[PDB]
Amino acid sequence: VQIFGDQVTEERAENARLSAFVGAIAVGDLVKSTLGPKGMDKLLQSASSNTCMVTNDGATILKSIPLDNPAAKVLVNISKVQDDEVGDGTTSVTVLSAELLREAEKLIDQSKIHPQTIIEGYRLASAAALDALTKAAVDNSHDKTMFREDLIHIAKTTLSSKILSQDKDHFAELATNAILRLKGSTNLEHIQIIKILGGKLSDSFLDEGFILAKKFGNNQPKRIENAKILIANTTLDTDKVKIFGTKFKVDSTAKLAQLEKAEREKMKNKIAKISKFGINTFINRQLIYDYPEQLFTDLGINSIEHADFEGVERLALVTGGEVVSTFDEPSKCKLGECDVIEEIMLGEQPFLKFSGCKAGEACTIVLRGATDQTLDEAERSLHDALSVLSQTTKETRTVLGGGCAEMVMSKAVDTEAQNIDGKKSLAVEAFARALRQLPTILADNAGFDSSELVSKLRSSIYNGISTSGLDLNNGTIADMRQLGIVESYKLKRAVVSSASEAAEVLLRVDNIIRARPR
Amino acid sequence: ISPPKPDTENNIIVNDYRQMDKILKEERAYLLNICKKIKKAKCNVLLIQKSILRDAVNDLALHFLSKLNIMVVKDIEREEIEFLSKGLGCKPIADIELFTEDRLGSADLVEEIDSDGSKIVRVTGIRNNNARPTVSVVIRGANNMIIDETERSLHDALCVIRCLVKERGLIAGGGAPEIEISRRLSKEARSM
Amino acid sequence: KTSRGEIIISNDGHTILKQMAILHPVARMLVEVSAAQDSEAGDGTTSV
Amino acid sequence: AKQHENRLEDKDLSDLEELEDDEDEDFLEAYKIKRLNEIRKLQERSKFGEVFHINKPEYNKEVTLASQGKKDDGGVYVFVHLSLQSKLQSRILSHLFQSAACKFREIKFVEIPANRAIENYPESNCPTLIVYYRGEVIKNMITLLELGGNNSKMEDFEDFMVKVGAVAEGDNRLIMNRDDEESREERKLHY
Amino acid sequence: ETKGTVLLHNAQEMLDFSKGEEKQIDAMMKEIADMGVECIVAGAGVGELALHYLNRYGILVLKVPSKFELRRLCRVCGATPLPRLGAPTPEELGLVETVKTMEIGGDRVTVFKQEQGEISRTSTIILRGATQNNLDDIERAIDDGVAAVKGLMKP
Amino acid sequence: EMGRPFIIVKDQGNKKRQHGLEAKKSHILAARSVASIIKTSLGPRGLDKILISPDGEITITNDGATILSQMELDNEIAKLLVQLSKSQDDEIGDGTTGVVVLASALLDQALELIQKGIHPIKIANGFDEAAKLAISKLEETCDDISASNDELFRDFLLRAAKTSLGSKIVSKDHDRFAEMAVEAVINVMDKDRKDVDFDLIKMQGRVGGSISDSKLINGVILDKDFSHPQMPKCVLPKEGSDGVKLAILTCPFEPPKPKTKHKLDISSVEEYQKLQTYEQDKFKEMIDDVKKAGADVVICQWGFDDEANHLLLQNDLPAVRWVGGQELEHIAISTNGRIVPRFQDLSKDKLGTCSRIYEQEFGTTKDRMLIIEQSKETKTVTCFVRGSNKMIVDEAERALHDSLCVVRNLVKDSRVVYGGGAAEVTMSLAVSEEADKQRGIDQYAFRGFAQALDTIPMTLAENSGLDPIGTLSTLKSKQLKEKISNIGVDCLGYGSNDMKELFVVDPFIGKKQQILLATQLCRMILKIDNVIISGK
Amino acid sequence: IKKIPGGAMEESLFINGVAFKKTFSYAGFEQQPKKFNNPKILSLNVELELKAEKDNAEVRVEHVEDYQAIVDAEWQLIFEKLRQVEETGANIVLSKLPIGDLATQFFADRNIFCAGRVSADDMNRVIQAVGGSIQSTTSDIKPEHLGTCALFEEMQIGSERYNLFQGCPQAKTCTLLLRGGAEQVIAEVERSLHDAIMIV
Amino acid sequence: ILIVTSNQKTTISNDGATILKLLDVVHPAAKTLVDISRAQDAEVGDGTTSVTILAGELMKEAKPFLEEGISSHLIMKGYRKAVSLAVEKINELAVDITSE
Ligand SMILES: Nc1ncnc2c1ncn2[C@@H]1O[C@H](COP(=O)(O)OP(=O)(O)O)[C@@H](O)[C@H]1O
Ligand SMILES: Nc1ncnc2c1ncn2[C@@H]1O[C@H](COP(=O)(O)OP(=O)(O)O)[C@@H](O)[C@H]1O
Ligand SMILES: Nc1ncnc2c1ncn2[C@@H]1O[C@H](COP(=O)(O)OP(=O)(O)O)[C@@H](O)[C@H]1O
């Protein structure tokens, strides 16, 4: 008795677990090459308008590619949450969560372990895993110079995976200065990344100011000094009063000539109130029409038009002033200050350069590359780098990487497996052996041995040296403190918790129900 | 330059029959007195931009401007207003209250010749207090496809002059530095 | 000959590569390099 | 076959009087009573005629519910305008609403600011034109590049109203069908 | 009939316009109610404000949204309708003793049975049956019987 | 036929019929097809299932109602089971999976009795008498908990809270979710411990973070930022004050305009300047009204323009826009404030009171979500649930909703029973005992219901991987040896079939509802003889 | 009698009045008390919200000083319409037409329950249950026309709220809530009772 | 009887009016059973079926008489004369009960 309708695919047998497990293996193997510093970039061919996209992050790749498997959606969704939460470590969650299901496959088939036992071991194994990071962390909050050095090494670790592995020595100073500029503001929207194609990749810079994408309107000068900035959000152009039911009962056109004159008088009166501040620059988000633009010329005030609302927030914080409207009361209102303003040209589009501002609560980064795809990859590199360093301020604790983070978890996880005697020990050992594969694929991408190199890292830590790790440029074990690579505590806490809970999803599934497409 | 119609909503009401003669007199007078004040500043040529929501210059206004010997040109692009003010040194005029003699430019001859069925309006001679003069070069040819390539061929020519004034110095082309750099790196390649 | 009714002659490699609609994405990257060479230098768009 | 139908179909109540001398009284007066009844229905349906500048609370009050009308499925088309004073096309579309309101009195013309329309609406997508009918959205129109953009005219707007079923094709008020008196004068002379 | 639209220039008219409609509708019902009428047959849709003052004094409302359905009822009581909303004339007022509402076919029906005194015309026949098709043929049999009664008048 | 087209009903050739014994086999096998889906899901050792909607969205659920709700079916017999699980989900919110396998158990045992030739009404009357007899026995044996104090009554909720959380994911952090679930009801409860309002506590999930980051906060969740974010994000109260003096308004900041369409005519320039004065004085009078009222944070329903941003920023007054009317219903009850319509009716008595207002990021760029917290007990609790996946946090919502519903059943007085398969077996042996003297013709009818109740313990035996016959033999022999009836099948392996020891409790009202909906549906399905179905 | 998908048929009970679905969530619904000891019912028909008065909307204003007064007049009359309902002590307010957020929040402050979005057949059952009358005007409200009952209590029934009236000395209404598993169970209980009620 | 119409609306009932209401009967002679069911359901509301299983037996019993040379009016005169005695006989079967 077929209770379901026509064209209803249902799998209530071993093929359901096989179809769900092979889907994660396909998603897992897709991202094995993108992990590590020697990883290869991937290429995406869009189906609409031939809009290509080059990206190394697994979140952008898996969201762009179509996948009809329900298991693929979990790997897509866990990567989307990791991309939005931290902004780094998405491929580690995808490859680790798939390897946990890969390691759990042989327990179901060969050893015939219950699914409730595998997850029960992962609960106790994940608990001991996070406890290892509790003692393995180090707080560098007592000294700012050491914390300044920590942001360097975290930038060295995050930027090495992308195409900027050579130029990370220069952008590490650029990345950490933007974080010390923001002085704790973890909002990534306060950094404008201006995209410019052409020039050498190392020609990027970080000017102490805010760079506009637009220019002056008609005749206002390029070079000035000692300018007072005033920002406004209201219309300031052909003021349509708040009630639209207004009308003019005109008995003669001569009186209507006075009414349009009265609209110019109040606008002339409004600009007269702007001059009471004694300013030299005025900025408004709405596009400025011709009539109020002309009155700024006689007053000696500059005018900038059509600024975006997200840029007004960046513009207010770099200038250090305040957005002013309802200009009758100039006493309570506040305005910013700047030393020099000058219009520059980087390529074809001109830009406005600000330098010497008082407040430095925000900045703008100007990137240079060759192809828009390289430029774009650069945009997705500093965003992932600055996202990790931004959360490092609120979460000062850090963890050493390079295979040492995954192994010190396995050292504590393997110790706890003996005190839980029974059939659960195989599940906890499967969680341990899943963690050994992260330094394995990191060695496979560089073209080194998978067994002997991991075996040397195994013996080095149990001897009583909790600072050993993999070094990929030479292919041998080296000290992590001397090389200077380290990750944040929130990152390693996130990928272990995300990959652990991701394994809990597709292990509690036995039946797959597919309704009709719409 | 048009009859009065503000951006704010309005509605003209006629209560008495004799008011129709009055408003018709005041409409042309609103165009006449504004054109009368143009004669006070003795401005001889006017350039209007592209007008939105209404006609730029009313046909009734052209009779006042044509009898007083004033050239009228409309439908100019908005981005070119910066070009004309920078070249001619004439500040724009957005209101008659700010319309004065000091803001206007100067020119010796504004001639519109008839040649090959294509009109050209060219200004001869510029003199002003301006440290950023302008330049204009027309293109002629057989068809538009050659006009487009003659423009882009000049862009590649000006970009060479832009590069020399940007970065000082130059090198001799014709395949010279490719063989020279290949010889130089080939000398050092055997040492490394 | 473009998709629409416009016809254009072109010796410039940037405008040749711009008007040519390429199916392969890696070959399409050369269109952006010529755009980058045209924006930065403005000379030798085919030599790059 | 069409020659007999053009006597009645292609003549309004003002034009049907021309056939008083040629055609039969009973044949003509029977159709004039029919067309006279249709004119009376449009007068009763002319509950509008000017732009309804509404607030956001009233947005339900005057738009969706109104589009139900009598709910005899007396539906009413409600053209909403998400206005924005900064954009160029918005003031152009506002002028078309004022002109179209004076002609099509049965169709409700609604306007509201775009900032007060949708939570944090993209300004680049403004102006926006929505057409409700019986509570359902018939057309979610995007900026006026489809309708010529900055060079949009009254003739293009009236043609759009015919596509959505708001105005009949052979309506005498449309500028496409409303031939000038000088046009018909020349046709009668050259006939 | 031509563009009935409110117009309120100041707040003094805004305050009295809401109460003016109530007092105006109430004042028209006073002249109707003082004549001792207790049921009014309406020809089209009745407003709610007019209904509130009708059922105050216990005046029954009846819908007859058609021309012939309204004309047949005047022949029973012998009333002369007037379209004005004023006082009905006493000579034109009809005479009906009782108006009952009972369940016959499961739906609500209104009856206008007269008595032996003050007889009326245009009587009806309640025809009960099981099959709707049989109601149609028996109804036309009454039309044939009523048509046979016409044969006695002319010759 | 006689040659002419013999048609009766419209669309004669499309629809079919089914009668006799074959109509019954289509019904029972259709229930077994649905029962196999639910049988491998029930119990603590169950397994989730993925329901792919037509729109591509998926839901990982192990609840019978959400599975059957998003399932595209054709057979009408399963569609009645779709509504039976939905019936258990709406009112009680516990046992959805049971009311399907139990109804199928009555249907499976009824198949054998139909083969013997018993009329279906005698079958249906037998379960009706057996169901009321089992309810009458179980009402006597269960004990009351109202005699205990409030300290022990909290523990009984923890017994049922851990029972409801388990068998679902959210079974790790389940010890804290039990305390969090009980702590939600301690704040929102009546002084007489009766008829608590469930609508005061709404569900709210957030896609992000981990399960450990979830915590309790007494306030409202708004998915929006403050207006013009130049002010500090976390506003604090004054040094000496009763609170922050929350203000709520259902009027946008604008000049007062009529609700009807109006035409303000300005026939002179002097009147036009007074309109400019009238425009500015209204905004000046507006900010002075809220200034004198002492409000710090203002909540506006219908938004406002950009003119009020600077007036609100200079006076240190945060504000928001586009707050829906449903949220204002939640804000007034939480902060104990009265929503004023306009500024003329503004008074200090109508303003609310709360501890502090602050906002955090939760990550990079997602969205700024507002948070409110109270300094004492209030009549509103908003669960702040986090999750690493959208399906995790979506399942955690309906899982915690069922947890609050199970505690809601215990708010009713004297309704407690120890589950774990004990309630099924203790109601089963008595029905077989009654049949020995109430034999009649319905002797096999009681035996069918006695065997149908025992299937849920056998279902737990299959999922746990134990021998069913040895389990039911030990439970049946133990119930006959001793009259203590709180011993059941423990599948989570803590040893001990005894159970009060294992801190598990089910609602008594939920357990009797299992056999009622199961018996009430079985009475309906057995009445069906002719099965007419039309083509789609 | 109405439909309630969800529940068991055995838990039904007899009701001396009406129980109708609200069918709308108001902004100030939770603020009102759910339990009145001595409630008083008053049936309304006027639409209690800020909108056009009588099927039209056109207001000319010449002076801007009067533009403030005409708006305050609309705010004055709408509270004058609500204050006449408040002065008579009507605890329960019912209307066929919708009730706006302005009115329900005014009633929510001083412990006055209100509801709307109900049919005319439901309204006619409310009058005969409480024994009151219909009043489509707030000015002609008197104390004598208000209906009363014993008590009031809004109870959770199948994830749907119903306003219960019961305990009247003389009730013309019997309306029971039909709860069941499937939608056909509640339907069969309706048709079985509808056939039995005609016989008795 | 379980019926599902074209719009996929499930219904379960055993009433002569409800079963014949959902079934769109196009046969002209068969709709007489639909009319008496609605007529019996509208007034009394019970025994709708007993009206249908009874009319069918009278028509089924009139089948062999129509095969014979019996005219149509003779069969109708028998039932119409017999039903008058059945109504009077049911008045005697019914009681004038007032006690209790
Ligand atoms: N120069 C290096 N020496 C040693 N280890 C390195 C070096 N560069 C990168 N790594 C290791 O490679 C890993 C790169 O991870 P990454 O690609 O950033 O993950 P995701 O892309 O998922 O965020 C780091 O864990 C780091 O320890
Ligand atoms: N007159 C000449 N004689 C010989 N070689 C030349 C002459 N002019 C240019 N060349 C060579 O030919 C090349 C022309 O490049 P060109 O076509 O200008 O590139 P693009 O068109 O992309 O700017 C130059 O690199 C130069 O070495
Ligand atoms: N931790 C536990 N220990 C023992 N029995 C349990 C436990 N959790 C649930 N059960 C039992 O499992 C049975 C099925 O519950 P379940 O199907 O998870 O709830 P629902 O049917 O509401 O989804 C219940 O009868 C209950 O007694």
Ligand SMILES: [Mg+2]
């Ligand atoms: Mg990385």
Ligand SMILES: [Mg+2]
């Ligand atoms: Mg449960």
Ligand SMILES: [Mg+2]
């Ligand atoms: Mg019966």
